[PDB]
Design a protein around this ligand. Sequence first.
Ligand SMILES: O=C(O)c1ccc2c(c1)nc(Nc1cccc(Cl)c1)c1ccncc12
Length: 356
Amino acid sequence: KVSRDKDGSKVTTVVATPGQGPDRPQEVSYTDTKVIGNGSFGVVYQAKLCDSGELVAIKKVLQDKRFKNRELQIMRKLDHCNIVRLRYFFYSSKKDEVYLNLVLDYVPETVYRVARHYSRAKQTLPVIYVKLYMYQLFRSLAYIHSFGICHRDIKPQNLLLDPDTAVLKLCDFGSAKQLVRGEPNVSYICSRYYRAPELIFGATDYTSSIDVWSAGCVLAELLLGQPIFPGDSGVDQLVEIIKVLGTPTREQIREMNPNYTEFKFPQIKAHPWTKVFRPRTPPEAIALCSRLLEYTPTARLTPLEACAHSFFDELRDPNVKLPNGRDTPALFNFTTQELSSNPPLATILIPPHARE
Ligand SMILES: O=C(O)c1ccc2c(c1)nc(Nc1cccc(Cl)c1)c1ccncc12
């Protein structure tokens, strides 16, 4: 690194490799560096790029140079406008230790912080924001699932937001992995409340539909004003699930983890979904929640099928505007890659007033 002091302000200069494009490192300078987060894996800083002036996030993470970094491999491959961009990366130094640094988009808000304000004010988030945020999350999932990549930690904190533009960036791919059928996967990924039933059961043969379950939990949380399946333990989470979905059937238990077929379960009958939410809740939203929070993983909607759900129809009306008067983000510029899982769905996703 190189530390200048233009007008006393500390300036860092590093030869950083761009994320996308060809492997051609560049001299990059930034200042105004301050810590804005700490995780189990490292610290995340905020900084100002010394030329463009734009704000960025820098994620410092220790790198044992023995193996490649899985997060870096996935982040360089991804390029989607609902996923936090990897602008650059570089290495630095604690002693005799190498650190990998990821320079990413700075995004000022998160879904968690927006939902908590409304919750503290005893206020419900307007459904237009629920449609906007949910749609962009599912679109980001449809894009990464097309590549076989499972995020595995979908949670409201991980959904960044620009409140002016209403644009959602999915972030933290440190738990993401390309899921190969037949090969086993660690079962202790995903955070509380948003863990799929198969993950609570410790299943190692799970699929990308666990991201769809977590998304259904985030949708239900936005409608309810609080997490739908809370609990400090697996039993507590499972009971809150069983109180809604009813007790799982023998076949459904075999679709998550057969190794849990003979165990004893709380024997509660299915509470009808309409009685789970507030009375003025849109029925199309309740319908979508029911199609994502299904016991059998193969029965859950795909992210692309979710984007085409009737709940998001208001996003396709030509007259839709943001509450603050601006235009909605670009919700229809689907690449054929995004539509890989089902291209015929494009007749619904891309509306007649958005073609050429
Ligand atoms: O990992 C990424 O991909 C990733 C990507 C972007 C951000 C991030 C993590 N973490 C942020 N901050 C943050 C907030 C709380 C805890 C922690 Cl550890 C970090 C942050 C802030 C503003 N804009 C973008 C980001």
